[PDB]
Amino acid sequence: GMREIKRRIRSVKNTRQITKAMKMVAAAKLRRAQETAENARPYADKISHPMLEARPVKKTGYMVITSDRGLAGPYNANILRLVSKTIEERHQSKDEYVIFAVGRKGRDFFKKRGYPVVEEVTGISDTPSLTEIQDIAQSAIGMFADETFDKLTIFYNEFVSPIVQRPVEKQLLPLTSLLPKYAETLIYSALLDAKASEFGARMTAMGNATDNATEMLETLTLQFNRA
Amino acid sequence: MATVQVDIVTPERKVFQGEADIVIARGVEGELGVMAGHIPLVTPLKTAPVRIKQGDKETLIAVSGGFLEVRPDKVNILADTAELPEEIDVERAKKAKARHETILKRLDKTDKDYLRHKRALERAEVRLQVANSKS
C-alpha cells in the first residue's frame, strides 16, 4: 500500500495538470468563436421558391453536428442520443434517412451502427472561416436542389449559457417565415453556434474535471500515508 | 463634392466602409457606376471589381458574387468571396494558374467545368490582375 496507489496519485495529478490547462483553452478558444459568430449577424441579417417552398415528403436528409476531437463531457453523446431517439420514430421505413456527419465524433458513431452517412466532413476547424463546409452545406442543399431531399435538417448543439447548451434540431431547406445562399449561411449560423457550445461545454467539463481531480486526489492521499 | 456610403461586405465581416467619392461596377446587364441620388436598384452582379474610391485613391477589388442594393442614399452589396486591394494573395492565384487552368481541357462532353473553373478562371485572374492594385 506504498507504491501503485502513488501511481494512481501521480497520474491523477497529471490528469489534473491538463484538464485545467484545457479548461483555459476551452474558454480561450470557444469565446473567440462568439466573435467569429456575432460577426455573421451583419450578413446574417441583410435579408414558390426555387422549390424551397413546403412540399412533401419522402426521403429526408439530416446534418448532425458534433465535435471532432472531443473532450466536452456529454455535449456530443447527448446529441447523438437525440438523432438516435428521434429517428427511432421516422424509420419504420428503409429510406434510411441519410445524415451529413460533420465532426469526427458523430462521424464514427454513424459508421459503427449503420445509418449510414452520405457525407463525413473531415476536420471541423475552430474558426471556422469561409472555406470549410461550403461543401457539405452546399451539397446538402444540392440534394434538395433536385431533389433527393424533400427536407434538410441540422442537429445543432444550441448554445444557451457556457454552463449549458441544448440538443436542438432545426429545419433548414424547407424555408419558413436563385438566392438560397440563405440556407448556406443558416448552416454557418449553426456550425458557428455548434462551436461555442462545444467548448462552452468543454470548459464546463474541464472545471468540473479539475475539481473532480483535486477531490479524488484528496481521497487518494489518505492512502499515501496510513497503511 | 458631396458623399455617399458604399459598403461592400462579405458574409463574414465588412470590407470597405469609408465614404465614396465616385463608384464603378460591372453588372450582368451593363455597368453600374454607383453614385448618389439613385432609385431603388437590385440585380445580380458579376465577378467584377468595384473600385470603391475613398480619397481618389483608386484600386481594383476582388469580388465574385453577391446581389445588388441601391437607394437614394446607401449601397450595400452582399458579395461572396471578396477582399482588400492588398489582401488579394497573388500566390494563392499562382496556384489556380496551374490547378484550374492546366486541367480545363481534359474531360468535356456535357457542360460542366467551362463554368465551374473558367468562371473560376475569373477569380483566378482577378487575384492576379487586381493583385496589381495594392495602393
User: Torsion angle, CA of B57/B62/B67/B68, rounded to 10 degrees?
Assistant: 20
What was the elucidation method?
Answer: X-ray
Q: Which residue in chain A is spatially nearest to B69 when comparing CA positions?
A: A46
Q: Are A67 and B102 in contact (CB under 8 A)?
A: no
To one decimal, the resolution in angstroms is 3.1
What gap in Å lies between CA A124 and CA A126, rounded to an integer?
A: 7
Which ranges of B37-130 would DSSP assign to H, the alpha helix? 90-96, 120-129
**What are residue A79's phi and psi, to 5 degrees?**
-105, -30
Listed in order, strand segments (DSSP E) in A17-118 are 62-65, 99-102
Fold for domain A1-47+178-227?
Answer: Helix Hairpins (1.10.287)
Write out the H or E segment, with its range, that includes residue A202.
helix A181-225
Q: Which chain A residues are within 8 Å of B76, Cβ to Cβ?
A: 46
User: Which of A168, A166, A156, A163 lies closest to A200, judged by CA?
Assistant: A163
Q: What angle do CA A105, A137, B87 make, to 5 degrees?
A: 105
Sign of CA dihedral B99, B105, B110, B113: positive
CATH 2.40.160.60 fits B1-88, yes or no: no
Chain A residues interacting with chain B (CB cutoff of 8 angstroms): 36, 39-40, 42-44, 46, 130, 178-179, 181, 185, 188
Question: CATH 1.10.287.80 occupies which residues in chain A?
Answer: 1-47+178-227
- B30-31 vs A165-167, strand pairing mode: unpaired
Q: Are A128 and A86 in contact (CB under 8 A)?
A: no
Q: Which chain B residues are within 8 Å of A44, Cβ to Cβ?
A: 11
Task: Give Dmax (Cα) for chain A.
Answer: 79
- Least CB-CB distance to B14: which of A42, A179, A181? A42
User: Does A130 contact B81 at a Cβ distance shorter than 8 Å?
Assistant: yes
Q: Which residue in chain B is spatially nearest to A43 when comparing CA positions?
A: B11
Parse chain B into domains and list their residue ranges: 1-88, 89-135
- Helix A7-38 and helix A181-225: axis angle, to 10°? 160
What gap in Å lies between CA A65 and CA A99, rounded to an integer?
A: 10
Whether B89-135 and B1-88 are alike in CATH topology: the answer is no
| CATH code that applies to domain A48-177 | 3.40.1380.10
What gap in Å lies between CA B85 and CA B45, rounded to an integer?
A: 19
User: Does B12 contact A39 at a Cβ distance shorter than 8 Å?
Assistant: yes
Q: Which CATH superfamily includes the segment(s) B89-135?
A: ATP synthase delta/epsilon subunit, C-terminal domain (1.20.5.440)
User: Which of A201, A193, A156 lies closest to A63, judged by CA?
Assistant: A156
